[PDB]
């Protein structure tokens, strides 16, 4: 739409009030955010299995209805993700060229999913038991949007070690996005949307992958063919290494000095963008992470040493 930049208000999935960037055109306001380097659009599929649906239009610039909630969050959190990338690394959208961010909410009926489809963000509303509206969790959004960035860089193949690395990368960043918005931060993934009645859980944990049965050491990796070679479980190995590099700890007899989330982020960003390839394995991830740290802090630096220490802890050389 073409119009005038407005600022509205609405309530998200968890019931919190949020500030919205919309556009006034004719008699209505549209969930269209013209404020950033990339345009952000939010759509309504009206509980159908169609894409992208209808661009979202409101009569008064107030998004306080129960039906509004998923759209308010989808809208807000994508602008927050753009922000994280723009401020931290000077990245202009998913492709470094201002590609627009599109999201469809109310997709299907009681659909327990949300993913980047290679072109836009897709959100279902959940069954209200296993999940709630999928747009209410910032780390899951940051995770999927980061998949858009890998595709525009390393392009890690979704199978075996390189696929797990892909998954790991996306968790690291979604976590980073959550800390970014001071969105009650932690190292678990999906706790704001998962099993709305049970407090305590998440889909997986970076601090202790074994809580959910994921491996936390190379010697314990899944070796078969299921899940494109165990893509979603083996990522726990890289997740654990990332956690120890940011916060420190003792793991399998190896003591790691943490360097903080900001350097963890710069090291992985640099690694994924200049060093990783489509088929980077965990051993090459170590070497590339090591080179990134050397470039960033110096070859004989304490950072580089932490990098080495962190992989050692998880059995990767
Ligand atoms: Ca309204
Ligand atoms: Ca949290
Ligand atoms: Ca989290
Ligand atoms: Ca829960
Ligand atoms: Zn993923």
The secondary element (H helix, E strand) that includes residue 75 is helix 69-89
CB 51 within 8 Å of CB 108 = no
Could you state, in order of their start, the residue ranges of all structural domains in the chain? Answer: 6-155, 156-316
CA angle 280/285/286 to nearest 5° reads: 150
Question: Which segments of 31-113 are extended strands (E)?
Answer: 32-33, 40-48, 54-55, 57-58, 62-63, 101-107
Instruction: For 156-316, give the CATH class.
Output: mainly alpha
Buried-exposed string 212-249: b where 16+ CB fall within 10 A, e elsewhere? eebbbbbebbbeeeeeebbbbbbbbbbbbbbbbbbbbb
How far is 167 from 163, CA to CA, in rounded Å? 6
Round to whole Å and give the CA distance between 259 and 302. 9
Q: Residue 279: helix, strand or coil by DSSP? A: coil
20 alpha-carbon distance from chain centroid: 21
Dihedral (Cα; 7, 12, 17, 22), 10-degree rounding: 0
C-alpha 57/C-alpha 43 separation (Å) is: 9
Q: How many CB atoms lie within 10 A of CB 97?
A: 11
CA dihedral 15, 47, 2, 98 (to 10 degrees): 80
* CA 270 to chain CA centroid, nearest Å: 17
* Reported structure resolution in angstroms: 2.0
Centroid of ligand 5 to alpha carbon of 2 (angstroms): 34
* 192 marked as part of a ligand binding site: no
* Ion ligand 3, residue ranges at CB < 5 A: 139, 186, 188
Distance CA 28, CA 39 (A): 18
Catalytic residue ranges = 144, 232
**Beta pairing, strands 40-48 & 101-107:** parallel
Helix or strand holding residue 263 (H, E):
helix 261-270
191 marked as part of a ligand binding site: yes
- 6-155 has which CATH code? 3.10.170.10
Q: Is 203 helix (H, G, I), strand (E, B) or coil?
A: coil
Q: Is it true that the peptide bond before 63 is cis, omega within 30 degrees of 0?
A: no
**CB-based contact 104:51 (threshold 8 Å):** yes
Give how far Cα 106 sits from Cα of 64, 126, 197, Å: 16, 9, 21
State the maximum Cα–Cα separation within the chain, in Å, rounded to a whole number. Answer: 66
User: d(Cα 297, Cα 90) in Å, to the nearest integer?
Assistant: 19
- What burial letters (b/e) apply to 144-165, b meaning 16+ CB within 10 Å? bbbbbbbebbbebbebbbbbbb
Six token digits for residue 35: 């404020």
User: Residues 105, 74: contact at Cβ < 8 Å?
Assistant: yes
The sign of the dihedral angle between the CA atoms of 215, 217, 222, 228 is positive
- What approach was used to elucidate this structure? X-ray
Give the DSSP letter string of 240-274: HHHHHHHH-EEETTEEE----HHHHHHHHHHIIII
Note residues around ion ligand 5 (Cβ under 5 angstroms). 170
**What distance in angstroms lies between residue 92's CA and the mean position of ligand 2's atoms?**
26
CA of 65 to the centre of ligand 1 (A): 7
- Whole-Å CA distances, 317 to 1, 22, 154, 235, 273: 53, 50, 21, 16, 21
Site of tokens 């996005």: 177
């Amino acid at each position: 739409v073409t119009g005038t930049n407005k600022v509205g208000t609405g309530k998200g999935v968890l019931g919190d009030t949020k500030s919205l960037n919309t556009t006034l055109s004719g008699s209505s306001y549209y969930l269209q955010d013209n404020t950033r380097g990339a345009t952000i659009f939010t759509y309504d599929a009206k509980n159908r299995s169609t894409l992208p649906g209808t661009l979202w239009a409101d009569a008064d610039n107030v998004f306080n209805a129960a039906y509004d909630a998923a759209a308010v969050d989808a809208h807000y959190y994508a602008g927050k993700t753009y922000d994280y990338y723009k401020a931290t690394f000077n990245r202009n959208s998913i492709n470094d060229a201002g590609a627009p961010l599109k999201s469809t909410v109310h997709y299907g009926s009681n659909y327990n999913n949300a993913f980047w489809n290679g072109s836009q963000m897709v959100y279902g509303d959940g069954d209200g038991v296993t999940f709630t509206s999928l747009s209410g969790g910032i780390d899951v959004i940051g995770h999927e949007l980061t998949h858009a960035v890998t595709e525009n860089s390393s392009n890690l193949i979704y199978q075996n070690e390189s696929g797990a690395l892909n998954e790991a990368i996306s968790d690291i960043f979604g976590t980073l996005v959550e800390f970014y918005d001071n969105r009650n931060p932690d190292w678990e993934i999906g706790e704001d949307i998962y099993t709305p009645g049970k407090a305590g859980d998440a889909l997986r944990s970076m601090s202790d992958p074994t809580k959910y049965g994921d491996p936390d050491h190379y010697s314990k990796r899944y070796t078969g063919s299921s899940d494109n070679g165990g893509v979603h479980t083996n990522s726990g190995i890289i997740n654990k290494q990332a956690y120890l590099l940011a916060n420190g700890g003792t793991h399998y007899g190896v003591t790691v000095t943490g360097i903080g989330k900001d350097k963890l982020g710069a090291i992985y960003y640099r690694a994924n963008t200049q060093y990783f390839t489509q088929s980077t394995t965990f051993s090459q991830a170590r070497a590339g992470a090591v080179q990134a740290a050397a470039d960033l802090y110096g070859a004989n630096s304490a950072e580089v040493a932490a990098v080495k220490q962190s992989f050692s802890a998880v059995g990767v050389n």
